[PDB]
Amino acid sequence: HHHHHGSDLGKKLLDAASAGQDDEVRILMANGADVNASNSYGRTPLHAAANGHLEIVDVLLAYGADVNASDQWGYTPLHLAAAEGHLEIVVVLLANGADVNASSKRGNTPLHVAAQSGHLEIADVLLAHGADINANDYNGKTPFDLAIDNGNADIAEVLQKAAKL
Amino acid sequence: KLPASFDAREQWPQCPTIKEIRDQGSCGSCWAFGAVEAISDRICIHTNAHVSVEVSAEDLLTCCGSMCGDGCNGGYPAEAWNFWTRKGLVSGGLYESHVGCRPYSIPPCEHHVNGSRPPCTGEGDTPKCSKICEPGYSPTYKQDKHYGYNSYSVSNSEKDIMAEIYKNGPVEGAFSVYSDFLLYKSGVYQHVTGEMMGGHAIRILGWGVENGTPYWLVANSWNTDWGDNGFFKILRGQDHCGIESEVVAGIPRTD
Structure with missing residues (x-):
């Protein structure tokens, strides 16, 4: 790889x-x-x-x-499509075997970047396809933490809901 | 037919940014500095000096995102030039210079030398993308954006890189840094010894021959008390340390 x-x-x-x-x-x-x-x-x-x-x-x-x-x-390509907000590319990459929990060298996963960048539907699609909501980046931050630190309330609500289960 | 030596500072004397050395501070942002420096030089060269601006390293460093790499933890020049063609870049000078829309926010420091500024420390935190100009400045952030027409890689070819600089101005490149390079003061650098410290991006603005050795004239972004007033020369023609292998440039929109 x-x-x-x-x-x-x-x-x-x-x-x-x-x-x-x-x-x-x-x-x-x-x-x-x-x-x-x-x-x-x-x-x-x-x-x-x-x-x-x-x-x-x-x-x-x-x-x-x-x-x-x-x-x-x-x-990976999935991290970049999630950071730039391209939902249809995220969909095709996942349909072609993209690793939904790929972790970068500073521990950023595709869900961390979608929560940080404010891309709600992408966050929902990664969540549905298996993204780890307890993943900690280099700073011990979870995707919920980054949504909260970046003012993305809707994504933080969804992530708060998923931890509830 | 190209001359044996060439210095963009001499060819385009009316473009002041070609002579200027910047300081990236305690931040791994060389990828951003090599790009905005060469972009600044090309905007002046391609508008026959009718437009002379310092392009903002801060804008590029904070707004590009993962397409360009990791902010203060290293980055990718080809996507930095692509971002300039995509989203553009606003103006922005040195730390606390109040030049331009978004001047650099990381303070200068001493890089591998002793001096009056604080020593550089571990790579800092990447600053936030704040799309607003400094309060004293006008036009607005959106109107201050400068766009590239296109960007492209240059082949791993001494001749193609010289032709590109000669015709279109300074380019950005990258090379592997070994620890003996950190001690450079003068002469033509040639790796002899030292551990590999990683790939670093710089601005190539000329070439020449010194002490019987062909060389590229390069600007580093470690302030002027490092190297030869901030610049260095490195062996040319042998893809030494990968210096001819990751060259990128682009043409500004003359709008």
């Missing part, structure tokens, strides 16, 4: 995925580009696509992208 697949053609695929160039990613993948091309930061085309490029997420998954690739800070 820790890629560092690096090359000229890999730089092109990473750039096309981060620029939202759907047709250019299709051309590079139809001609042998490495779907998990990476670099010294462990970032892959699917991490770049998680930043709101659903059609590119679908193409890279069709070519076998590692859905749980972890970069040098321990973030």
Whole structure:
């Protein structure tokens, strides 16, 4: 899961995925580009696509992208889609095997980032698919703590409810 | 055909930020400083100095999020340049300079040298994304945003990196830091000994030859009493320490 697949053609695929160039990613993948091309930061085309490029997420998954690739800070594509609020990408990643409880090097899970960023439906979908509400980050904070510390009342209510059971 | 030496400070004398050295403070934000420094230089170069601004490291460091990495705990230059093309960046100068919308909030410190400022400490806490300008400043945060037209990686090629700096201005790069690099004062750096301390991002603004050794001219963000007034030279042409392997840049929106 820790890629560092690096090359000229890999730089092109990473750039096309981060620029939202759907047709250019299709051309590079139809001609042998490495779907998990990476670099010294462990970032892959699917991490770049998680930043709101659903059609590119679908193409890279069709070519076998590692859905749980972890970069040098321990973030996976699911952490980034949850942080940026892209509900449909979070749904597709989970339907393709994404680890709902992946923990970054500073202990941040996808649920911590959705509670911190104020993305309620994403928090609800991760919760329903198994996210650990008692996970502590580097600062001993749980997702409820971060929702509370960031003023996201609705998410804190949902998390408060889930601990009640 | 490229000259044997090139210094963006000499090629674009009317762009003051190319000469300036910043201080990231007790925060692992080199990824952010290399980006806003080179972006500041390119905004001036590509508007023929009609627009000269210090781009805010604070804005980039606090608002990008996990797409750019971990704030004061390390970050990712390619997504920093992407954020500038996406959301833009406001202006913002040095700590307590009151220059721009969001000047840097982390105080300067001594990096691997003795001096009158406090010693740098462990990576601090990342400051909050506060989308509001300093009270004394006008325009508003939204109107102060400067946007990039595009961003891109440069190939791991000495020649392509020189051509890109020559034509479009300073770029951001990263390299592996070994402990002998922390003691740099002058000369062309070449790793000889020391433990690996990690990858660090910087701004490359030129190249030359010194003592028979080809080199890249680089700006660090450890203030001016570190290195050679804040700058350093490192072996060029051999992807030394990975210096030619993670170069990124981009063109500003001339709007």
